[PDB]
Design a protein around this ligand. Structure first.
Ligand SMILES: NC(=[NH2+])NCCCO
Ligand SMILES: NC(=[NH2+])NCCCO
Lengths: 209, 213
DNA sequence: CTGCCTCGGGCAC
DNA sequence: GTGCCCGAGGCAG
C-alpha cells in the first residue's frame, strides 16, 4: 500500500473487461511527472488521464485540488505539443499493458513456425555455419540491449530508486519513460522476447540437422 | 466508406484524450473474429469490447443483433479467462496503438545515447571488428524477421487480402493477429525499429569515433 | 474547444 | 451472471 497522503486519486483502468482490475492509484509524484517537462499536460488533458467528468469549471476544481497538495497548474497552460494514445495511460496500467504484451509475445507469438519458415529460406548447405553465427550474434546483441533497458531506474508510481546507470544515459531513458508513462522500455523488451524465441527456435531447428 | 451493411457498430476509442479520434467502425468480420476460435468471446466480453451499457437484457439484445447478421452466439458460452488488456481493443484502436508505439520508438527512443553507452561497454580495440560484424548481422537478421511480419495478410477491419505467404506460416501469423486484435505483429515491428535505430547509431558512432573525439 | 446530459460500466448483490 | 444509477465522456454546438 502507498501512503494515502501520497495518493492523488484512484482511476479505473481503460483496457479492463468486466471489472478485471481494481482501480489504479495515481500518486502526487505521477501527477507531478505529467505536469512537468517534457509533456507539461494542462488541466483538461490531466483531467482525461485521471478519467474525471468534464464539468463546468472542472479545470478550476482540478487546479485547486493540485494547489492543495503543492503542485501549481496555471489556468492559461496550453495543450501539450505531442499526445499519443500512450498519453491517456496511468503509469500502473502502462506497466501492466507492457507486461501483458510480454505475456502474449512469450505465449502466443509463433516463434517455432517463424524459425522453420525463415531457416527454409536458407537451405544452401554452405551457408548454415554463417546463418548460425548471424543468429547467435543477434541473440547476444539483443540481450545486451534489453539488459540496458532493464537497468532503467526512472521514477514510476511512488518509487524513486537510486539509479544504477550514470546520469547521462539515465536522463535519456527517463525521457522515453515520461512520454510513454512507463510503457516504452518494457514494451520494447516484451517485443524482443518474440525475436529471442524465434532465434532460439531457429538455432534448435538447425541443430536437429 | 465501408458498406454500412458490413458495419456492426462504431466504438469510441478507450485510449483517446479529449475526443482526439472518430469512433472506430467494428465490421461484422471483426465481430466474427472475436466469436470464433481462438478467443470464442461470449456476449458479456463482446459487450465490453463494443463498450455497450450493461442494461436489463443486454446479453439477449446483443445475441438477437448477432442472429440478425447470421452469427449464432449461444447464451451459455463459457467466459474466456485468458483475456488480456489487448482483448479490450477494437481492431482499429489496436492498430492505432501499434502505430503510435512505432511513432514513439522512431521519434522519442534515445537510440544515439543507447548506442554510445553500449559501444562504451565494448570499447576495447581488440573487439571492435567483432562488435561491428555482430551489429551488422543483428541488422540483417532483424530486417529479415520484420520483413516476414510485414507480409502478414491476416484479415483486419473490412480487409480480406489475398495471402502472399504459404498457408502454414500465414495461419500462425493470423493466430497472433486474432489474440492481439491486430496489435501484435505491428507492435513487434515498432519495437524492432527502436533496436534497428540503436544498431544504426552504434555502427555510425564507431565509424565517426575519430571526429567524435 | 466547452460542458450538458446520454448511456457506459464499477459495483453490489 | 445481472443490471442500477453514479458520473465519465461523447457529442452537440
Ligand atoms: N514485461 C516485459 N517487458 N516482458 C518481457 C518478458 C516476457 O515474458
Ligand atoms: N478461450 C476460450 N476458448 N474460452 C471460451 C470458452 C467458451 O467456449
Amino acid at each position: 500500500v502507498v501512503n494515502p497522503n501520497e495518493v492523488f486519486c484512484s482511476v479505473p483502468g481503460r483496457l479492463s473487461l468486466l471489472s478485471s482490475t481494481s482501480k489504479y492509484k495515481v500518486t502526487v509524484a505521477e501527477v507531478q511527472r505529467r505536469l512537468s517537462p517534457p509533456e507539461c499536460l494542462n488541466a483538461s488533458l490531466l483531467g482525461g488521464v485521471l478519467r474525471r467528468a468534464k464539468s463546468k469549471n472542472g479545470g478550476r476544481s482540478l487546479r485547486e485540488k493540485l494547489d492543495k497538495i503543492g503542485l501549481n497548474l496555471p489556468a492559461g497552460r496550453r495543450k501539450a505539443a505531442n499526445v499519443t494514445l500512450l498519453t491517456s495511460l496511468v503509469e500502473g496500467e502502462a506497466v501492466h499493458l507492457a507486461r501483458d504484451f510480454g505475456y502474449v509475445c512469450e505465449t502466443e507469438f509463433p516463434a517455432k513456425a517463424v524459425a522453420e519458415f525463415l531457416n527454409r529460406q536458407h537451405s544452401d548447405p554452405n551457408e548454415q555455419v554463417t546463418r548460425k553465427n548471424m543468429l547467435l550474434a543477434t541473440k547476444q546483441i539483443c540481450k545486451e540491449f534489453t539488459d540496458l533497458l532493464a537497468q532503467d531506474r526512472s521514477p514510476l508510481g511512488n518509487s524513486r530508486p537510486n539509479p544504477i546507470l550514470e546520469p547521462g544515459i539515465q536522463s535519456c531513458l527517463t525521457h522515453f519513460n515520461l512520454i510513454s508513462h512507463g510503457f516504452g522500455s518494457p514494451a520494447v523488451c516484451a517485443a524482443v522476447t518474440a525475436l529471442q524465441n524465434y532465434l532460439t527456435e531457429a538455432l534448435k531447428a538447425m541443430d536437429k540437422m
